[model samples]
Structures are given as C-alpha cells and as structure tokens.
Target: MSMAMSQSNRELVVDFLSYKLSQKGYSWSQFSDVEENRTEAPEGTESEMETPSAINGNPSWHLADSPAVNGATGHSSSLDAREVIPMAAVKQALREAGDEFELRYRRAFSDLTSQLHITPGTAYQSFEQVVNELFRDGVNWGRIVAFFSFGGALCVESVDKEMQVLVSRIAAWMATYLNDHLEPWIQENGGWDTFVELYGNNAAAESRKGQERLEHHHHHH
Candidate 1:
C-alpha cells in the first residue's frame, strides 16, 4: 500500500471511531483525557518528560471539527467541491493506474454470477442483498480492511505532488457514496442534515468561533 493511501485509511478509521464514540456520548475532551492517562507517565521527572504541556506536544492534538483526525472539510456539499489541485492529482493517478482494478474485479464478479446463471439485474440485486446483510450483521471488517490496504498501497506508490490527489479522490468517493446511498434514507427519515440543523448547530457555531479564535490568536502573537 502507498503511504498516502495508508494515511487516508487511517484517517477514515479514526473518523469512524470518533463518530461511534461521539454517538455513545463520549465527549472528545473526556476521550482525550483517558488517552492521556493511558499513555502518560505516573510520576517524577520522567513523568514530566512523558506528559508534555500540550498533549503529544501538539496544540490541536484532539480537535474534532474535521470528524476524522486527518479528514478536511471541503468547500461545497457537491461531489465536485473538493480542492481542485488534489482532485486533479487523484484523477491523474487513477487514470495512470489504469482500469485494471475495475476490470479485474468486474470480470471476477461477472464470472461468479455467470456460474449461477442468474439474470444480470437479479445478480446485482442478490449481491447487494448479501452485502447489506453482512453490513447489518456488523461483519464488514474484512471489506473495510481490504479497502484500507488497497488505498495504503496506492499511497506508497504515489509521489508527493500526487498525495493530495489521492486524498481528494478518496474524499470524493466517500461523498458520492454517502450522497447516493445514505442521502435517500436520511431524507426519508427526516434527514440527518435536519437533525444537525436542530441539535448539532454546535458544529456550525463552533466553525465561526474557530475563525474568531484564529484571528485573536494571530493578533496576540
């Protein structure tokens, strides 16, 4: 796996975990504190060395505005809203990487379906049903791991200029997937966006607070 893809996968995992934890009512601060205690020294000068004034000696160590530790918010809600440079980079990489991945996977799936002699639509529907069942049963770890591994391999093969492109592609894929699949369900159920508009305006409010904080910090410095 490429280092860039690996980092992206890591970020996705972190985001998933953070979302799960937040859903369970674990505040980010509380989780960070627990993490600190688990890793920090218990006593003495050695303890001082271990316990840096800033957690891990980083000012924004546990900030959660981005959902994932490394995920960045994009400029627009649309699929094409990614930062242009990175998006271009990923497109280039994917083009260069060729259609082998898709072709191979598609052929394999086709062969399997052909063996069953099912109609094309029925095969697709069956595949979707099986996948949904696996997901509903929470047995999706294998798929998740494979995705991360493949992404990681790509990142390692990619150059510095192309790293952001890899990130943008992954982000774009995720946005598209969510919009295509989850958006309908959400809208039908009164929408997560609506819920956020009501109960989680904190995210929007804090974004403004962040701009003010940055301005104040810069002025003071």
Candidate 2:
C-alpha cells in the first residue's frame, strides 16, 4: 500500500532519463511535443519498435564483467550457478518492470513533466545531479528498482515520441549504469534474486492492481 517507493523511483527515472537523452541531442522541447501528440494521436499509430541494427549484435554487459562472477570464478573451480542470480532472470525482471513503468506510475510520471522545467539545454546536468542524489544515501533494493524503472519510462517515452531509436541507447545506458554502479552492491545484497523476492513479484502485481482500483474510483469524478 506504500506509494513512497513508487514516487521516489519515478523521480530518479525522470531526472536520469532527461539527463541521458540530453547528451544525445534530444531536448525537453521535443519531449513536450511528444506529450502533446500522445493525447491526440490516433489509435494503432504506435508501431512496434525494432531493435537498432547497430545494437543488435553487441550486448551491453557480460557475465565475466560482473564483480560477483569474478569473485566466484577466482575461487571456485565449478563456478556454481547459484552464486548469483542469472543475468537472464535479471533482464526478464527489468523488462517486465519497464513494460509496466509508465502506466504503473502514471501520476508520478506526469507530475515530473510539469515540475521539471529544466533550463533550455541543461538536462545532462540534471542527470548527474539526480544520480548523485540517488546514490548519496547509499544504494538499496528500492533505489536499484527505481533505476530499472527509469530505463523503462525513458524507452516508453521515446517510443511515444516516434523516436524508438533511443530504445537501444537507453538499454545500453542502463546496462552500463548497472555494471559500473550497481553490480557490486547487488552481489552483496544477494543479487537480483533478492530484489525479486522483495519487490518484483506479488508486490508489483499488488501495486498495479491497486492503481487500477484507484483509477476506477476516480472515474466517478
């Protein structure tokens, strides 16, 4: 029933995405245009997004690159699969979360658009600021989930803007951020498996169903 986790996660995602896209020459103005069109765009216009050809071959992060894998590989001859959560599972969880993010946290996402009036071209700066703020208190399960949700929100927003090209870049950015920043902590905290146990299963389902009920309640208004 707690919405605090949902709210904060949306904040980090929105700020970080704005920052990353700004680096690639996308602007807040462009996003504003997307928002405007989203309300009026006809049905079936939202087409399927293809994986960018350039990114199709190269994967973002590798098993060998993970600190957990390295630690286990160095000492254990068998390299037990149970040492950490498999990357496949981690990716599945992330994908599901991303798929649901925009809808699951719609109000928070909308509030972000209204409140975050970043200067004309200062979104990249906002990225660094938001990231520092996110990790300032130390990383945790909630913050990590927030990171994944951010990636989802960005991808969804990009597709709505008819800039599905950014999806690959967003995925790459998320993997890099995960490898560079979160891998160690994730391993320490029992990996993505722990995250799933805490936030990914029933909790996520409950949160979504709760949103449905709330929206229905508001339909009367």
Candidate 3:
C-alpha cells in the first residue's frame, strides 16, 4: 500500500460508512462526525486516487455525480476534490482489512472449531457470533466502516480450510449474512442514491447534524 492506499483506507471507510448510514439503526456520527485521522499506507504503495471519470468504468461501485467529502480530512470540500474517492479504493481497503482480520483472529476461529467439535448448531452460531460482535462494536460511522471492512475481509481470507473448514465456514456464513441480512437492511433503508448523498459535498452541514445528534443523545440519555 502507498500514499493512495492510505487515502484509499479512509475512502473505503467512508464507503463503509455510507453503506452503514442506510441501515435501520443508523445515525450520522459513524460517517461524518469523526476527527481521529485514520492511518496511511506505508513507504511507497501510495498513489493519487483515480478521477471521477476513471470511476466511470467500475460495474460495482462508483463515486456519485455529487461532489463529496475529503475522506481523509473529515471536513467539507467541492467538486474539484481530487480527494473524494474511487470505488476501486473501497475494494482495496476491503481486501487489506479482511486479510488483516484473518491474521488477527486466526486463533479465535480455530478455537471455535476445537470447542464446538461437531455440533453444527453451536458451531455455526459461534462463527456467526464472530461477525455479529464485529457488527456490534462500531457505534458510529468510522467504527462501523472498520467493522464491515474487517468483517468482509475476514470472510474472504478465511476460506483456507483452516481448523477443519470451520474458518472457511465462517467466511461462507458471512457471505450469506451480508447478502441475506446487511444488503437487504441497506436497501430497505434507502439504497445507494441516499448513500452518495450522505458523503456529498455538503459534508460540513452533515457533520454538524451528527454533532447535534450525539450531544442530544448523550444529554438526554
């Protein structure tokens, strides 16, 4: 990963955030309110993000026609934002994040297999719990993005027949979970048209909304 990869990390997190904002129990905090700077890519993997037109070819994801946030900075910006994002960056982030999750939790997955042995019911729930806990952690946009990225990455990388296929089973479970649960949740909420708007050029106003919502939630709760 290079400089662009660093930027890509943030961009994908935002992409993750946008994906989350459309969920049922969503709020703006996870997407727009954070200020903690995400890490950058190492030595030389960095590069400039592709242009908006460059994103034109991706069949899966695209930067909307709307000007969007400076993903790295968390402030607001305009259409000329060479810094918004590209769909490929999101994919890159998912790959990196997923692989990282596998390295971090390889032991956990193995333990699951050993403990559950052959009880398919408990075994399935145990692995499902892995991602379920992941889904639970990030209460805001940044955390949510990190969760999904890590969770998605974990799913893709764990297909190695590790621990007698339990790890791979976890990955398989995640694929079904995302397709069956998360995607429908997002679509039922608002879909990508609304997703793009959440990170649009009008981010400052959006961030302010997040701020007020947080304060109100805290003060009233």
Candidate 1 vs candidate 3, lDDT winner: 3
Task: Point out where model 3 deviates above 4 Å.
Answer: 1-90, 96-122, 136-144, 152-164, 188-221
Give per-residue CA lDDT, model 3, range 31-104, as digits (tens): 23334344443334345544554455577545444334465224544445575444553343444344444455
- TM-score, each model? 0.22, 0.42, 0.30
In model 1, the runs with Cα more than 4 Å from the true position are: 1-162, 197-199, 203-221
Of 1 and 2, the candidate ahead on lDDT is 2
Q: What's model 1's lDDT at 47?
A: 30
Q: lDDT per residue, candidate 2, 156-184, as tens digits?
A: 56654557455545544455456656766
Model 2 accuracy (lDDT, Cα): 0.52
Better of 1 and 2 by TM-score: 2
Name the runs in model 2 displaced over 4 angstroms: 1-85, 95-126, 202-221
Candidate 3 Cα deviation (angstroms), residue 95: 4.0
- Residue pairs in steric clash, candidate 2? none
RMSD of each: 23.6, 17.0, 18.4
Q: Write down the worst ten-residue block by lDDT for model 2.
A: 2-11
